Amino acid sequence: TVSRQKATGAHFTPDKLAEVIAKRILDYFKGEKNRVIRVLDPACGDGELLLAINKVAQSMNIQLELIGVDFDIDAINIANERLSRSGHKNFRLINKDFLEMEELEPVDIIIANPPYVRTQILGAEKAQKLREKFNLKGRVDLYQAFLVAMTQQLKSNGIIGVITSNRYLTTKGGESTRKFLVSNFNILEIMDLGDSKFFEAAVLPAIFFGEKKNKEYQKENSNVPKFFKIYEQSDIEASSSVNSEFNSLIELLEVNKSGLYSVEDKTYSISLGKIISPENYKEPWILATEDEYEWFMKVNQNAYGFIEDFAHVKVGIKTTADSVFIRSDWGELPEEQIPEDKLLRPIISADQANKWSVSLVGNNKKVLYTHEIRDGQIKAINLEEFPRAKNYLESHKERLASRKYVLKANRNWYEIWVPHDPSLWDKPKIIFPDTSPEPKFFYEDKGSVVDGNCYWIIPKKENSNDILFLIMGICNSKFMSKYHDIAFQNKLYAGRRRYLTQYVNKYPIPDPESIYSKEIISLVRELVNNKKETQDINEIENRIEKLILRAFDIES
DNA sequence: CGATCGATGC
DNA sequence: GCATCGATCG
Numbered sequence A: 001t002v003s004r005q006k007a008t009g010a011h012f013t014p015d016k017l018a019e020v021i022a023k024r025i026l027d028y029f030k031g032e033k034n035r036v037i038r039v040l041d042p043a044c045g046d047g048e049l050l051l052a053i054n055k056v057a058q059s060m061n062i063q064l065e066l067i068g069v070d071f072d073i074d075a076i077n078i079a080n081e082r083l084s085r086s087g088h089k090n091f092r093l094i095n096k097d098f099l100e101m102e103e104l105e106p107v108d109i110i111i112a113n114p115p116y117v118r119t120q121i122l123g124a125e126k127a128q129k130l131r132e133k134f135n136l137k138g139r140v141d142l143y144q145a146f147l148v149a150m151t152q153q154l155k156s157n158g159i160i161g162v163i164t165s166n167r168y169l170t171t172k173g174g175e176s177t178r179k180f181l182v183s184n185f186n187i188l189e190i191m192d193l194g195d196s197k198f199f200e201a202a203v204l205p206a207i208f209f210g211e212k213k214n215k216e217y218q219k220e221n222s223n224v225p226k227f228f229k230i231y232e233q234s235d236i237e238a239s240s241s242v243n244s245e246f247n248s249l250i251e252l253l254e255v256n257k258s259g260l261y262s263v264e265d266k267t268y269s270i271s272l273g274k275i276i277s278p279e280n281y282k283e284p285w286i287l288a289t290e291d292e293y294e295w296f297m298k299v300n301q302n303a304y305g306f307i308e309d310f311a312h313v314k315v316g317i318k319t320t321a322d323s324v325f326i327r328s329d330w331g332e333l334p335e336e337q338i339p340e341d342k343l344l345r346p347i348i349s350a351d352q353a354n355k356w357s358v359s360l361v362g363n364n365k366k367v368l369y370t371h372e373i374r375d376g377q378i379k380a381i382n383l384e385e386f387p388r389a390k391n392y393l394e395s396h397k398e399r400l401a402s403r404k405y406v407l408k409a410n411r412n413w414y415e416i417w418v419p420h421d422p423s424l425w426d427k428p429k430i431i432f433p434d435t436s437p438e439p440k441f442f443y444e445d446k447g448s449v450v451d452g453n454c455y456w457i458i459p460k461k462e463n464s465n466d467i468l469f470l471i472m473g474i475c476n477s478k479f480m481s482k483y484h485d486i487a488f489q490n491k492l493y494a495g496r497r498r499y500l501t502q503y504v505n506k507y508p509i510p511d512p513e514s515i516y517s518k519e520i521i522s523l524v525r526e527l528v529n530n531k532k533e534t535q536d537i538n539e540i541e542n543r544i545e546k547l548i549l550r551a552f553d554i555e556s
Numbered sequence B: 001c002g003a004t005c006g007a008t009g010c
Numbered sequence C: 001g002c003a004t005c006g007a008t009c010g
């Protein structure tokens, strides 16, 4: 199920992309450049990065000592053959685990593309060892441990050029990585390659260039960190101009002017600017232009608060066996195994998501809910009281009992892993999908369950009314989409944002007592009650955009 | 406990 | 194309 390429992260850097990284490294290198420079690739694969940096260095008449490490002998054998045939004799390859889970003196240059292996593939046990050894936190990825490991092999004032997944820039679990990078390096440049798809794998990579700090120093300050951001721009503004003077996508990585660029069948939006105070490592690092960052600043100052202050942003249920607990064909089961109607709760998924109004006009999904309120406490149901539902779960005994995290928690083998509080489903709530290219927050007061591909919003104050309607009008607006693309830059392919709790908690909210917020609430109340409204919903939506702009005191 | 994260995945 | 869904961590 898990390929050897998946578990070992064996994806080689393309030809032209490796050359781009090598050119930027040797341009940033302030070292001597007339002696032998030692270069390290801590996961060299077939030697692609070492070949690229030597080809560039030989043009500059620089002599390199190439060092490559890889724990796979097959990669070492092919890299030895390629390096030997290149003509360069001063190279050295080591077959070992670089993380050390027999010596090497520090190097002047590191060029790297470490493997990206998620915590689930590493396993919980190996992930704990990596966190304890390399001082990492959260859902650690392998490239994060390599980042710490390879940095400790770099001389002070040495240059690093390393390409990884861009997810440390915006995820909560990237906090330890951001802290380590800004602490150990004078950040030279961060390149967010976005959804350009240089690799055959579905990944959005970032390239980090930095000069390792020396323990004795100055103020630096003469170095201000810059960024380069390129994403696929599908929709083009009617008044925006496109530059088509570049032939290949790899040439766009060396442009030095922000704007729209078209290569073949796709248009790209390239942004250049400065990293703004990366020492604040607890929030995502924002890569935005001067105008975008200033607009982002004035919204926060004029904001009355944030969603986190007014409501609980929760995830839907996580059964950890969706094809067993969530079905639409309950009536088509054998009558001996059709669960009792008390247990089958209608559940809303992401494929029924629209703005304001739910697409519940066509739905039949129900969840076999396994929890209930008993003596004022949340307890799992007793199977003896539900014979038909018991037989159904008996047929799935081996798979449901395989969930080791359920048994080590001393919970019943048949339970839903995250059922939440059964009493909270009755409250009015906002629902929205996680993976979506557009906000689809909608009101729902029929007391149904929310699926794991959606999040839901319930107020902190027990007045489940106007406050939810205000939050909807804010979240669904184009105003908040602009704010989102600046502050929370976590994108999947095809322009999909991630509407996660850690992001939606930070949405700004205006004063719910101002006359502007009062009119927004009345318009949102109309959009959910008047399902006879069609097409001219856009008319109401436009009135909300101008109201939100006056509520935050800005014209965008 | 309850939200995260995805060299996405099928 | 286009929207995971289940191990995981705190």
Ligand SMILES: Nc1ncnc2c1ncn2[C@@H]1O[C@H](CSCC[C@H](N)C(=O)O)[C@@H](O)[C@H]1O
Binding pocket: A008, A009, A010, A011, A012, A013, A041, A042, A043, A044, A045, A046, A047, A048, A049, A069, A070, A071, A072, A075, A096, A097, A098, A099, A112, A113, A114, A115
């Ligand atoms: N623990 C470890 N120690 C050393 N190498 C490792 C490793 N885990 C994975 N690798 C190696 O890291 C490589 C990542 S693919 C990167 C290859 C090369 N850097 C390039 O850009 O083309 C794989 O070949 C894999 O064999």
